């Protein structure tokens, strides 16, 4: 724990084995700690190199053997006996023994870690600082501890690949968190058991019932992919059920030299022709408008809140037209290359430790946003708009280093992250809101006006729009003739199909897809052809997607609801905090999903009946 405890522990250490999540992270971390002085060496895997370099750890000169894995080193599955679909009843998969194993393509990596453990006295985990990263770290620990059971294991904690971050990580090594690793092992186990049991059950059944339609096709089930599909089918059904209604409104306009002023009815609209016709007839006879109230107050447009993964995934889709799967891929690439902080975080509060003044200063060489960044500094300094969330691990996603060498979507997302950061550190746009109330035959109409005085954050953030709506001068007490007095017709509009940002928003609201896993589940329902994208580009459910959701929902128990997965994900967060143990969560979640499975097997014919609506007869 203490500096003296660490120095004592390090004594007699000559070689320190360091392991990163991917080779690019290993090359990057080794390059920064060594100042490019590192010496490249080859591992038993051609894509996972070894970078040896001399370094000073807790008062001990060591040789750092920096290598990497390629994501998860170990694969989870049932034993060979349960692996075959026709070898057991899907129901037994809720209790069937599960094992972890190293795949053939990763055996070269496992053997490199084992090889280096023999020449090394300590192990430092350099995997990304998230739940999966801690689980990968524990996969590396298990492999190395098989060689040296008394091996000293440490964990390097960092939120960016920058010289100061990686140097501080070496001065502040900690113990690997078994609690967060265990939550990953619990989720991995539940996903395999619920996934396998429900997939084998429906695929085998529906392949027998609809052979011409679903031949050799995989009807997969996921504890999270199912309520995700549920949101898409729920919205489609809402639109299908929606009844549009004709409404009527009195529109009063007044022509001015450089623009028509439209006064909006205070009654807004009426769903009755006679009710509006009567009020309109009163307006045609004596249409003389009188200025009742000319009111004005200061209006402000708020600068963006500090950026977290969800807001990045949603704004990149809405504003940049990059889908969440790609955003997270590019965001990880920019993180690995040292340009942004770790892009998997719930934090929207800038920690007090973090120097925002330097991060702003760093962006002043840019031709586009450089002048704005300087402007923040000239106006006293950065004043961030923080939220209310903090994971206590990472800061909000922000630019950590300046680059002008990016291209394509990589440039677009970096530019977005930089502009959002500067906008957040800036001031709110300040304007002046005005309103003019007119009376026509005791009926009140209102015209609105806006005059922006200081655009502020808007000058760096073009993704938000604020526009002046300048109204002509109306004196309180004035009388005038309106240009037109109309009785126009309207109709109520249904909701629209969900966009990816709309779907992420619903998932967030209901507590599913937590730990930045939204994209993975949206991608699975896309790939399995349960949902399809319209040209708009919104989510439209397919006949199999539709049939499955209304099949399970007709069984009584509301299975398309995200309540059960939200409870599962809630329990996983408890495991991480040490607020719950992994054995109670596993026993409880398995008993809960085994019950839902047993009820679904009993009413299996409901699935056939719901899909028969689309595929017709079948036996």
């Amino acid at each position: 724990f203490s500096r003296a405890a660490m120095e004592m522990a390090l004594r007699g250490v000559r070689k320190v084995l360091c392991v990163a999540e991917k080779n690019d992270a290993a090359k990057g971390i080794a390059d920064l700690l060594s100042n490019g002085r590192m010496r490249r060496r080859e591992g038993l895997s051609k894509f996972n190199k070894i970078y040896e370099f001399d370094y000073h750890l807790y008062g001990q000169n060591v040789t750092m053997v920096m290598t990497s894995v390629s994501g998860h080193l170990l694969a989870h599955d049932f034993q060979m006996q349960f692996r075959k679909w026709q070898s057991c009843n899907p129901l037994v998969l809720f209790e069937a023994e599960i094992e972890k194993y190293c795949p053939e393509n990763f055996v070269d990596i496992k053997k490199t870690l084992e090889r280096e453990t023999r020449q090394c006295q300590a192990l430092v985990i350099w995997t990304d600082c998230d739940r999966e990263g801690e689980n990968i770290g524990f996969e590396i620990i298990h492999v190395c501890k098989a060689v040296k059971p008394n091996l000293q294991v440490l964990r390097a904690r960092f939120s960016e690949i920058t010289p100061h971050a990686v140097r501080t990580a070496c001065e502040n090594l900690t113990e690997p968190d078994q609690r967060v690793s265990d939550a990953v092992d619990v989720r991995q186990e539940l996903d395999l058991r619920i996934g396998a049991a429900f997939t084998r059950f429906q695929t085998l059944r529906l392949q027998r019932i609809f052979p011409e339609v679903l031949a050799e096709q995989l009807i997969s089930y996921g504890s999270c992919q199912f309520p995700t599909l549920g949101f898409v089918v729920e919205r489609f059904k809402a639109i299908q059920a929606f009844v549009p209604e004709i409404f009527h409104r009195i529109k009063v306009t007044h022509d001015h030299k450089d623009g028509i002023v439209e006064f909006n009815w205070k009654r807004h609209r009426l769903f009755n022709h006679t009710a509006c016709l009567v009020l309109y007839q009163l307006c045609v006879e004596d249409p003389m408008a009188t200025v009742v109230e000319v009111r004005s107050k200061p209006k402000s447009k708020w600068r963006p809140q500090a950026l977290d993964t969800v807001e990045l995934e949603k704004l990149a889709s809405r504003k940049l037209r990059i889908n969440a799967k790609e955003t997270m891929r590019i965001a990880e690439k920019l993180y690995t290359q040292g340009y942004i902080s770790y892009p998997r975080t719930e934090t929207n509060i800038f920690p007090r430790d973090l120097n925002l003044t330097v991060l702003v200063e760093q962006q002043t060489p840019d031709p586009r946003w450089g002048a704005f960044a300087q402007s923040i500094l000239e106006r006293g300094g950065p004043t961030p708009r923080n939220g209310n969330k903090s994971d206590q691990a990472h800061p909000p996603i922000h630019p950590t280093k300046y680059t002008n060498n990016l291209q394509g979507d990589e440039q677009r997302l970096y530019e977005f992250i930089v502009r959002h950061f500067l906008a957040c550190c800036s001031q709110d746009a300040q304007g002046q809101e005005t309103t003019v109330e007119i009376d026509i035959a005791q009926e009140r109409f209102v015209a609105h006006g806006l005059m922006i005085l200081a655009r502020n954050y808007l000058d760096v953030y073009p993704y938000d729009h604020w526009s002046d709506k300048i109204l002509p001068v109306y004196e309180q007490g004035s009388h005038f003739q309106p240009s037109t007095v109309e009785m126009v017709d309207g109709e109520t509009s249904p909701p629209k199909l969900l966009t990816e940002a709309d779907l992420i928003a619903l998932m967030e609201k209901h507590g599913i897809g937590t730990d930045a896993t939204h994209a993975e589940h949206i991608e699975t329902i896309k790939a399995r052809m349960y949902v399809g994208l319209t040209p708009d580009k919104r989510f439209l459910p397919g006949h199999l997607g539709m049939g499955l959701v209304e099949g399970y929902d007709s069984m009584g128990y509301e299975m398309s609801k995200p309540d059960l997965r939200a409870e599962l994900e809630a329990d996983l967060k408890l495991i991480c905090d040490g607020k719950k143990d992994k054995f109670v969560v596993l026993r409880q979640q398995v008993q809960k999903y085994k019950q839902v499975f047993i009820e679904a097997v009993a009413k299996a014919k409901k699935l056939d009946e719901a899909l028969a609506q689309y595929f017709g007869n079948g036996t």
Binding site: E245, R267, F271, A275, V278, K314, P495
Partner: protein, 205 residues
């Protein structure tokens, strides 16, 4: 012979609530109240109350006693003056969509239906009747005593100066008083669910 009690009740009904009733209904009503409370000799105060309670529960359509003036529907625009104790057959909010209203009434949750990633005073339209002519009553100014859940057959006093157009009365709070009551025959057909279901084209109604 209850004609002596009938005149006293008629005097009170008009004086206290501006309620006009036919003599035959009034005499039949008093006789029934006397049979119901057979053991006693009721006071005029108790008789007047019980007669009025029976009136509040009576369908004006079955009373055949005109109150509203002749050809009120024939005049395109005008003003109505005087006191009228009419009956609401049905009632609906025209400031809100009937689909939106029926959803809330049916208690179903449509929260996910209005979820997006992107960052109106009430007007009741009353179907009023004196039992012979049917007109409309509009919430011209907010009348808080009226609400959509008022039972079909509810008796209301319509008084003062009221401007009317195309068979619609432009009612202000100073022109409305709710007396109460209900009509069993109307509770069935013109329940708020049924009124709204008709406006969104739901069958078997």
């Amino acid at each position: 012979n209850v004609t002596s009690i009938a005149l006293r009740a008629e005097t009170w009904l008009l004086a206290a609530w501006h309620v006009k009733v036919p003599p035959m209904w009034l005499e039949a009503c008093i006789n029934w109240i006397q049979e119901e409370n057979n053991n006693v000799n009721l006071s005029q105060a108790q008789m007047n109350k019980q007669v009025f309670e029976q009136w509040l529960l009576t369908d004006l359509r079955d009373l055949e006693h005109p109150l509203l003036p002749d050809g009120i529907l024939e005049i395109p625009k005008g003003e109505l003056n005087g006191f009228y104790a009419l009956q609401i057959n049905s009632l609906v909010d025209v400031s809100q969509p009937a689909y939106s209203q029926i959803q809330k009434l049916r208690g179903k949750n449509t929260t996910n239906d209005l979820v997006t990633a992107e960052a109106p005073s009430r007007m009741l339209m009353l179907q009023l009747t004196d039992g012979i002519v049917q007109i409309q009553g509009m919430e011209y100014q907010p009348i808080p005593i009226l609400h959509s859940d008022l039972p079909p057959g509810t008796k209301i006093l319509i008084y003062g100066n009221i401007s009317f157009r195309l068979g619609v009365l432009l009612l202000k709070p100073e022109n409305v008083k709710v007396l109460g009551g209900e009509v069993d025959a109307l509770l069935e057909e013109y329940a708020q669910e049924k009124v709204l279901a008709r406006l969104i084209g739901e069958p078997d109604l």
